[PDB]
């Protein structure tokens, strides 16, 4: 694979989103997952929606939690994901309202990596696109994040509690890292972005629960 892998030059990724109080972080990566693979098929980019996903997966607990495979799953099985536009996010779990005319992507099916191999991971974001990550973001050295490559002794790769999204790699002062979207906001962060430690023993288990649509 290559040394520096970064979608977002590739105009995969959209914006960063504000999940908000609503613990809908799942289907934040999942929606990024998705959107990175709708511009690799079609050559165009929008935000596709996060609130379709909470208020239709009923597998998933909403804003209380939730699987991205689910999400994907919902996507394959539903025939379709709408835009943003067509269905916004209101920070809330509510009724579904999925409209076929305002479908945005399809879904294939999905993949998952082998659990804890950073390794596959790496192969996965490199040939694949934006790949959904889950990771222990419980941390105050995580919440308060603003530069460098991220890595805590604490962070518990078994106690995965939050989800984001891996879109790209890399190396910053000899510290190979992750190229990571949060779903809290522009201002957490370096710009919503934080570059969490790569080869370091799984950091914060970036490797244990990650997955892909294909599309
Ligand atoms: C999205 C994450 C989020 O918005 N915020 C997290 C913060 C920033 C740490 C967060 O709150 N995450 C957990 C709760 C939590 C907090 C702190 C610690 O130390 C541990 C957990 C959360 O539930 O947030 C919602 C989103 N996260 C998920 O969907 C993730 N799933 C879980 O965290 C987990 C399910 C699970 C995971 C691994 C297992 O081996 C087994 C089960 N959720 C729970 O355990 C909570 C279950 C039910 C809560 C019901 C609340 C009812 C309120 C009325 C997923 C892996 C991405």
Redo the contacts with the bound molecule.
Sequence with gaps: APDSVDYRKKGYVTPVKN?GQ?????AF?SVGALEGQLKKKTGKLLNLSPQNLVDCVSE??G??????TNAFQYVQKNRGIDSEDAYPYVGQEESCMYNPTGKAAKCRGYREIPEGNEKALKRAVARVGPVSV?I???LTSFQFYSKGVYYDESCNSD?????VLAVGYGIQKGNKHWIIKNSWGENWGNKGYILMARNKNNACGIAN?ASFPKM
Excluded: E, K, R, V
């Design positions: 999940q609503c613990g809908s972080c799942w990566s998933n607990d804003c209380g939690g939730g699987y991205m889950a222990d973001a419980s106690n995965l509690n939050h989800a629960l």
